Motif scaffolding. Sequence first.
Motif, PDB file in Angstrom:
ATOM      1  N   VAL A  19      -4.664  19.440  10.394  1.00 39.30           N
ATOM      2  CA  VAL A  19      -5.288  19.603   9.063  1.00 39.30           C
ATOM      3  C   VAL A  19      -4.524  18.671   8.144  1.00 39.30           C
ATOM      4  O   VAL A  19      -3.313  18.943   7.885  1.00 39.30           O
ATOM      5  N   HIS A  20      -5.207  17.625   7.685  1.00 42.83           N
ATOM      6  CA  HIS A  20      -4.565  16.411   7.127  1.00 42.83           C
ATOM      7  C   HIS A  20      -4.965  16.193   5.664  1.00 42.83           C
ATOM      8  O   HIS A  20      -6.104  16.397   5.306  1.00 42.83           O
ATOM      9  N   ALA A  21      -4.028  15.722   4.856  1.00 41.45           N
ATOM     10  CA  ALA A  21      -4.251  15.375   3.439  1.00 41.45           C
ATOM     11  C   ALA A  21      -5.143  14.140   3.362  1.00 41.45           C
ATOM     12  O   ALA A  21      -5.190  13.360   4.332  1.00 41.45           O
ATOM     13  N   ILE A  22      -5.762  13.943   2.204  1.00 40.10           N
ATOM     14  CA  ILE A  22      -6.687  12.801   1.958  1.00 40.10           C
ATOM     15  C   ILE A  22      -5.891  11.491   2.041  1.00 40.10           C
ATOM     16  O   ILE A  22      -4.689  11.500   1.756  1.00 40.10           O
ATOM     17  N   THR A  23      -6.546  10.413   2.446  1.00 39.77           N
ATOM     18  CA  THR A  23      -5.911   9.070   2.538  1.00 39.77           C
ATOM     19  C   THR A  23      -6.711   8.025   1.763  1.00 39.77           C
ATOM     20  O   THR A  23      -7.834   8.283   1.324  1.00 39.77           O
ATOM     21  N   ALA A  24      -6.104   6.860   1.638  1.00 41.44           N
ATOM     22  CA  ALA A  24      -6.608   5.662   0.957  1.00 41.44           C
ATOM     23  C   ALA A  24      -7.935   5.184   1.567  1.00 41.44           C
ATOM     24  O   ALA A  24      -8.690   4.509   0.843  1.00 41.44           O
ATOM     25  N   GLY A  81       0.861  -1.197   0.000  1.00 40.75           N
ATOM     26  CA  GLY A  81       0.000   0.000   0.000  1.00 40.75           C
ATOM     27  C   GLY A  81       0.879   1.223   0.000  1.00 40.75           C
ATOM     28  O   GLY A  81       2.098   1.057  -0.260  1.00 40.75           O
ATOM     29  N   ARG A  82       0.340   2.394   0.353  1.00 44.08           N
ATOM     30  CA  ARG A  82       1.145   3.645   0.316  1.00 44.08           C
ATOM     31  C   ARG A  82       2.362   3.482   1.233  1.00 44.08           C
ATOM     32  O   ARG A  82       3.472   3.862   0.809  1.00 44.08           O
ATOM     33  N   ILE A  83       2.189   2.932   2.434  1.00 43.79           N
ATOM     34  CA  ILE A  83       3.309   2.859   3.426  1.00 43.79           C
ATOM     35  C   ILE A  83       4.316   1.801   2.963  1.00 43.79           C
ATOM     36  O   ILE A  83       5.532   2.083   3.011  1.00 43.79           O
ATOM     37  N   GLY A  84       3.826   0.622   2.572  1.00 43.16           N
ATOM     38  CA  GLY A  84       4.680  -0.492   2.119  1.00 43.16           C
ATOM     39  C   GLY A  84       5.627  -0.040   1.030  1.00 43.16           C
ATOM     40  O   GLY A  84       6.858  -0.232   1.178  1.00 43.16           O
ATOM     41  N   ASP A 116       5.178  15.749   5.995  1.00 41.59           N
ATOM     42  CA  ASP A 116       4.879  14.818   4.895  1.00 41.59           C
ATOM     43  C   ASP A 116       4.438  13.521   5.562  1.00 41.59           C
ATOM     44  O   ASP A 116       5.318  12.746   5.975  1.00 41.59           O
ATOM     45  N   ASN A 117       3.125  13.314   5.674  1.00 45.91           N
ATOM     46  CA  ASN A 117       2.521  12.169   6.397  1.00 45.91           C
ATOM     47  C   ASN A 117       2.900  10.845   5.723  1.00 45.91           C
ATOM     48  O   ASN A 117       2.890   9.824   6.419  1.00 45.91           O
ATOM     49  N   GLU A 118       3.247  10.861   4.432  1.00 41.75           N
ATOM     50  CA  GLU A 118       3.668   9.648   3.691  1.00 41.75           C
ATOM     51  C   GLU A 118       5.172   9.419   3.887  1.00 41.75           C
ATOM     52  O   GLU A 118       5.543   8.354   4.411  1.00 41.75           O
ATOM     53  N   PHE A 119       5.994  10.391   3.498  1.00 39.03           N
ATOM     54  CA  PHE A 119       7.462  10.236   3.307  1.00 39.03           C
ATOM     55  C   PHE A 119       8.220  10.405   4.633  1.00 39.03           C
ATOM     56  O   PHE A 119       9.225   9.717   4.864  1.00 39.03           O
ATOM     57  N   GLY A 120       7.788  11.347   5.466  1.00 39.86           N
ATOM     58  CA  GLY A 120       8.307  11.471   6.842  1.00 39.86           C
ATOM     59  C   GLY A 120       8.193  10.150   7.600  1.00 39.86           C
ATOM     60  O   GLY A 120       9.236   9.577   7.955  1.00 39.86           O
ATOM     61  N   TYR A 121       6.971   9.655   7.778  1.00 35.21           N
ATOM     62  CA  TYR A 121       6.675   8.423   8.544  1.00 35.21           C
ATOM     63  C   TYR A 121       7.427   7.212   7.954  1.00 35.21           C
ATOM     64  O   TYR A 121       7.968   6.428   8.745  1.00 35.21           O
ATOM     65  N   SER A 122       7.434   7.050   6.630  1.00 33.29           N
ATOM     66  CA  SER A 122       8.136   5.958   5.905  1.00 33.29           C
ATOM     67  C   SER A 122       9.645   5.952   6.216  1.00 33.29           C
ATOM     68  O   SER A 122      10.245   4.858   6.365  1.00 33.29           O
ATOM     69  N   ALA A 150       4.050   4.065  15.874  1.00 38.15           N
ATOM     70  CA  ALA A 150       3.000   5.056  16.151  1.00 38.15           C
ATOM     71  C   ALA A 150       2.429   5.557  14.824  1.00 38.15           C
ATOM     72  O   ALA A 150       2.436   4.833  13.818  1.00 38.15           O
ATOM     73  N   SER A 151       1.868   6.746  14.812  1.00 35.40           N
ATOM     74  CA  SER A 151       1.231   7.273  13.588  1.00 35.40           C
ATOM     75  C   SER A 151       2.116   8.369  13.044  1.00 35.40           C
ATOM     76  O   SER A 151       2.986   8.885  13.777  1.00 35.40           O
ATOM     77  N   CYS A 152       1.839   8.736  11.809  1.00 42.83           N
ATOM     78  CA  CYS A 152       2.464   9.912  11.188  1.00 42.83           C
ATOM     79  C   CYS A 152       2.136  11.142  12.024  1.00 42.83           C
ATOM     80  O   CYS A 152       3.045  11.962  12.203  1.00 42.83           O
ATOM     81  N   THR A 153       0.904  11.295  12.516  1.00 48.70           N
ATOM     82  CA  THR A 153       0.548  12.505  13.304  1.00 48.70           C
ATOM     83  C   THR A 153       1.300  12.508  14.650  1.00 48.70           C
ATOM     84  O   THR A 153       1.728  13.606  15.089  1.00 48.70           O
TER      85      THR A 153
HETATM   86  C1  LIG Z   1       0.108   8.942   8.442  1.00 47.42           C
HETATM   87  C2  LIG Z   1      -0.991   9.267   7.396  1.00 47.42           C
HETATM   88  C3  LIG Z   1      -0.658   8.868   5.951  1.00 47.42           C
HETATM   89  O1  LIG Z   1      -0.642   9.689   5.040  1.00 47.42           O
HETATM   90  O2  LIG Z   1      -0.390   7.468   5.587  1.00 47.42           O
HETATM   91  C4  LIG Z   1       0.014   7.095   4.272  1.00 47.42           C
HETATM   92  C5  LIG Z   1       0.478   7.445   8.315  1.00 47.42           C
HETATM   93  O3  LIG Z   1      -0.047   6.623   7.399  1.00 47.42           O
HETATM   94  O4  LIG Z   1       1.269   6.889   9.040  1.00 47.42           O
END
Ligand SMILES: */C(=C/C(=O)OC)C(=O)O
Lengths: 333, 333, 333, 333
Positions: free
Chosen positions: C176-181, C10-13, C313-319, C148-151
Amino acid sequence: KVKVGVNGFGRIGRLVTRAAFNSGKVDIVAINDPFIDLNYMVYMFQYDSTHGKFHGTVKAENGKLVINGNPITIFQERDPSKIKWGDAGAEYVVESTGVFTTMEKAGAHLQGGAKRVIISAPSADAPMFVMGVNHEKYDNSLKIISNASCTTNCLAPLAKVIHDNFGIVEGLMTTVHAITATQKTVDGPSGKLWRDGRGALQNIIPASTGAAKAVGKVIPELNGKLTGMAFRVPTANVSVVDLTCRLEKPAKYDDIKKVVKQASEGPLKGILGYTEHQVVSSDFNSDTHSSTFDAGAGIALNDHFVKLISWYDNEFGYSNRVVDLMAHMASKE
Amino acid sequence: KVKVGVNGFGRIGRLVTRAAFNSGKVDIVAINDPFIDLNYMVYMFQYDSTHGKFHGTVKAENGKLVINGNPITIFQERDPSKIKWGDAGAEYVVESTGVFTTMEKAGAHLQGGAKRVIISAPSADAPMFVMGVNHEKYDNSLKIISNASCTTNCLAPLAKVIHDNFGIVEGLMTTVHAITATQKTVDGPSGKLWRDGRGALQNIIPASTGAAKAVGKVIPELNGKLTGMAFRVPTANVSVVDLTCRLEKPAKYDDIKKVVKQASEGPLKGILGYTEHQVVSSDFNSDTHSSTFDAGAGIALNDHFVKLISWYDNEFGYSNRVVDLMAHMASKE
Amino acid sequence: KVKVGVNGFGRIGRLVTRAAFNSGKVDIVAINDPFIDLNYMVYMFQYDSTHGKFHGTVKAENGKLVINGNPITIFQERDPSKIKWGDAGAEYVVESTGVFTTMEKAGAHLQGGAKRVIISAPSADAPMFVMGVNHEKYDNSLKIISNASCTTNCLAPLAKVIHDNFGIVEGLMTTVHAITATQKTVDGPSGKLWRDGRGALQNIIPASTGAAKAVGKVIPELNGKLTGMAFRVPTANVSVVDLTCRLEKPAKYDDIKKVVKQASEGPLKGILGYTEHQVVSSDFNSDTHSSTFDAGAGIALNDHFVKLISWYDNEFGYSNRVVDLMAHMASKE
Amino acid sequence: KVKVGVNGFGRIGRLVTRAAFNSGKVDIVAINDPFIDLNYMVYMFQYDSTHGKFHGTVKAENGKLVINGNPITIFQERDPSKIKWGDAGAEYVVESTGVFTTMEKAGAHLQGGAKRVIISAPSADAPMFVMGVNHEKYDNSLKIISNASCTTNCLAPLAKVIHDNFGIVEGLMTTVHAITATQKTVDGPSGKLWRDGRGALQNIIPASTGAAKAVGKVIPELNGKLTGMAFRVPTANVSVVDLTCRLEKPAKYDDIKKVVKQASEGPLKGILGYTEHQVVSSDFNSDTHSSTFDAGAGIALNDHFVKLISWYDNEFGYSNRVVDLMAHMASKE
Ligand SMILES: */C(=C/C(=O)OC)C(=O)O
């Protein structure tokens, strides 16, 4: 090698500046914009919503814009005849404001000491050139020149390959176009063109364009054989051409694909691209091609009637061709 | 008058239901959805991001859905053979899940006691109809019918008028289409259609469609004469058809305008609209037409070769044509 | 050095996988996804609407996914217990489907021979780590772990610097968060979370999040002193935290800016960022920071009541943090 | 009854006009706008991307704008000192351009024969009012008046109920705000506010606002106890206030719900709303409330520290309050 001046620091003005530093094919030595002072220029060039952060250095040092250590002279002149291009050492000027498109207005740059002038827009009377189509017709006697539109730099290289091979009897083009600086965020006044005032985030917006018709001036054999129109849709960047065309000689879709992929790897390399991948628009963000043919997206009804699809980054593709033209001009001096 | 059951409370199910009460042409008396509980049905029908809050009353009362006072029977039946449409008194069933489009699967609604099934989607083998084009070709013998695709319902009424007066030699159609429920918010899995998986907010997405080829089946003279494709663009609703076609007879653009306008006033009134206004897509949000001809947006290369533009509310126009179809099936029982 | 398996492409994988090759901090030797074939994995990994084309090489070759010449074993196992992680040499597994977040379900990867599991989501029971905050509390006894979470990874590093220096009496967070899957393109079914089904392109959507309360687990001194909520807004990527907190000791905005800038240059470097630039969300697209303090966007009411703004960057930061967490885990075996 | 002139036919000028005709509380007799001629006005008023097409009639007839059979005199003056309001019979002028918000500039309308001016924006010196909060402190001596801002009109009625009942010791406000006419479609010049220059479709954009502070002018007891900031997000319309406040008296969430519902049903009816529904921003499009408290979206940390959520249609709500304020002014003549 040739030293360049840019009038206007808008999306085209900044992205031509960015493409010159990335390609190294020309040298930016002056910029003029009466509404953007030096610190604001640092910020507008450094940060870009569409094409990301500049990969390089950009700073204000002793009244100059300094990019990758190269100092650039800054003018704040609302009248083009008052820009000391020749003092700053600017041989060619990129006219990118969009308001000085006639040979009379664009010619003001010759007063400041500039030798040649490239208009980054269509021109009523300046000779129009498209790289890989009619650039070889340029000579030293032309001092004021136009690089046509982004849409024209998309349709024309594709049109050429299809005409040269099967012959275009007649073609109608639709461009599905990313939003631009000329549209509005919410319903607002656009006195000349009423639809263009309507909220660009909310609306599919039909627009006129002479970009198809204009292929007839860079490919004379197609003069009067092409016209079309546009839909502005709510994306930030990247546009697609939809060319519906009758051919007089028979063309199987695999033949069309064969000749286009031939042209992409040969003389039109880096101008006209070819792909069979399952691409969408954001796949061509910051793509430097004028045109990338989308094999899987187009469709033929028969051997003489086809729909052909080609993508273009309307910002980055066009800006890289403005640099590519100035390098050709300077090779022929 | 005729008592209707709806399978699936998706976009189409709710708006078919919504158009029913607004037009009074039919009486909804049953909904089956097994992923959407009665309380959730109140909320999903009451609030619509695209079409605003339902003008009227909606409440859950004694295990029913009560809309403007009319109690509706709610089923949670994963399997259509097992829905007791007869007990609830539903004469006609609308089949809107989009997974029961073949005559075999759609037929299951007859086991439950329904007499007729309208399929709100193209069907491999069920007979397809477009109001204003071949709805009179419907007779009491048929018990499993399709109302085609929203796109076919936009192209067909226009193709019909053009072909009636001028003849269509051949046509290629592009539809610039609003995002649908099958697309993704971000790059996600769409195993059979890789492009429809790409983020719908970010991208212009090229897509296959049979809506143009499908026009061959409701106007048999046009069989093999039309095909096309679509672009998905980031707008919530409203779509547009771009028909490039060749005509055997001369048609001046003012002649195309006169005939389409004349059709819009006459037999095709309320199905095909005509406008000369400077319209954009949101001007047609919740517009009940199938097809509105856009006079100013279209362009002609010459008397034989034309690009014609027609808008459609892909949600609301289509949903009103399903209600219209079922109304006509009742006027002939 | 440490060999890593990813469960879920998925996006994180995919972006964990992308971060592993770009950083070179770990070796992806294995991926499991039952809905995405080898071929389709080449395309989803190579082309990304948000982060652009993969810089490097990706191909299918002899049943394996080959990234930058490194072959990767592909599994298609629905049941986590039955993935042969040990045969492919996957020592750590990244649990990134978000449906195996409990220590019971996450343990399933140890059946197939993995040694350690990092859940790329909050967990009800598994110990949770934030890089630069509590990652030193990790040791070799631990086999099942949550990043944990991106947030939480945006809020916790800022909360730590603010608490360390001035003391947080209490605070309330908005993201204030971007759209997700998990959101929908158009109003669709979301039975647990009715707001989350409303169309993601049309709407500001309020949502619940435990991410502020979870900061109480990674900084035990803030237990019971933070909570918050979210708004989903129509952007593809990049989110922002808004922290309204009461401060025990008096803090002028300039003192807050100094200690945050200091922390970002010192022990939280690469995790906490700091800027005085006039940034907007897209300036942080593909920014690998967990949290970037925006000095100009925040505001103080008084020396003890302030609103602090931090981008992620909720995708790239957390990854990138998932790869950093596994790399720190390899160093302490 | 009172006859009214509108200076500026932008979003506020058209929607005040639309609200004047739909509520019937005042009569629009005159419109001034130098950049929008009569035939353009018929279009811009008739078709709205956000609020839909006007429900009624509008035509250009004998040099007047005729809305629902009422003829409206159309000026085209750049300098307000020269609009002949008196001769057209406009007693109140709505000053909605955005560039004449000081008492000295807005006063120019008195020279044309208008008796009072309502500034549809915050003012540096003109007295500011919010309906339901301090509008009863208006009196017949005041000839130049401000209706504050859309954001102040949202915060003030909620802050008054919370402060009357529990005591606001301190509050910080964030507003997540839809895009406006001052923003840009793509990265463009915004010399005074660089962030507002960046592409409004691509970006969450932080901004300054005096709205939370201005609440301290319409509720003198909260002077110096509120401030905040804004984020601009890519939606066409509808905004949300996020108020983080500390209270003197204890307030369980259910006590806050109780007293907000009570004021919304009683003396703040039609100004402050109350709902427990799973609403999203589009559910408030064309909603005429100043403020709708979202019970389910808010969260308390404890009985003295809470975050409260209130929605507002920043175009329609504000426009209707301008008509209401003029209805109140006419009643006290
Ligand atoms: C934080 C939100 C996001 O954008 O996920 C892809 C997270 O997933 O850890």
